[PDB]
């Protein structure tokens, strides 16, 4: 199999750069249209990260920053599969996550929300998907938090995530939410996404048979990256 380029990103499936209801986008969006290019080796390659470099608690946000005790909050496991648009698993992709603690507070002096800091919660994790594109991490469910867009704006609970996979063209950062959170329906950030079906694609689902008794709940969340097409006639990449 000789690989060609990644399928074109479908701009209608993503938020536009300029989205007036998300006020900060007004001054941080290009006025010119993006220039589309035909792909080259630069766009279809990406770096490789070795498993050796990861620590044993890198994907366990409950314990990876625990000092005198456990962090306070709802214990949850989040798992799922990363695959490309043609349904092929994405192997050995670097998945990084970051989030607020149970009060909705980020561990940084910049965040001055009154929600309380947790001395035993850090809020960063990472892992590599396996051969089946599977990933799993454990954490504390983040709490929703206020921000200044309109004065009384509130983000639904969410975990930020980032993927570096096989091609630079697949590079993606996004955020997922939790089934049933009522703030999901009012968020200006989530509403930058044009269609309802794509907004639903960022909601992690309760996975009840996978809860661990007397221990943790579990949410299932799959991720889809752009996929490469195979070439059977002329290979123009090079």
């Amino acid at each position: 199999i000789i690989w060609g380029a990644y399928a074109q990103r479908n701009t209608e499936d993503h938020p536009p750069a300029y989205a007036p209801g998300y006020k900060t986008s007004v001054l941080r969006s290009p006025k010119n249209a993006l220039i589309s290019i035909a792909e080259t080796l630069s766009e279809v390659t990406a770096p490789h990260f070795s498993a050796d470099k990861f620590g044993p608690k890198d994907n366990d946000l409950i314990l990876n920053y625990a000092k005198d005790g456990l962090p306070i909050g709802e214990r949850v496991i989040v798992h799922g599969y990363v695959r490309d648009q043609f349904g092929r698993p994405v192997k050995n992709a670097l998945v990084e996550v970051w989030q607020a603690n149970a009060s909705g507070r980020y561990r940084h002096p910049n965040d001055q929300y009154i929600g309380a800091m947790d001395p035993n919660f850090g809020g960063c994790g990472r892992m590599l998907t396996d051969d089946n594109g599977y990933y799993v991490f454990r954490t504390i469910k983040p709490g929703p938090y206020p921000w200044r867009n309109r004065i009384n704006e509130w983000r639904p609970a969410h975990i930020h995530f980032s993927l570096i996979a096989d091609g630079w063209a697949q590079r993606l950062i996004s955020q997922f939410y939790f089934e049933g959170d009522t703030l999901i329906d009012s968020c200006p950030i989530l509403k930058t996404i044009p269609s309802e079906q794509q907004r639903r694609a960022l909601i992690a689902l309760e996975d009840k048979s996978n809860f661990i008794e007397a221990d943790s709940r579990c949410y299932r969340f799959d991720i889809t990256l752009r996929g490469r097409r195979a070439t059977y006639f002329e290979n123009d990449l090079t």
């Binding site: 990103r9 499936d13 938020p15 648009q85 993606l172 079906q197 694609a201 960022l202 990256l225």
Partner: peptide
């Protein structure tokens, strides 16, 4: 065929 997961700000 699946749709790419939608981007969101960092």
């Amino acid at each position: 065929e699946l749709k790419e997961t939608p981007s969101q700000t960092g």
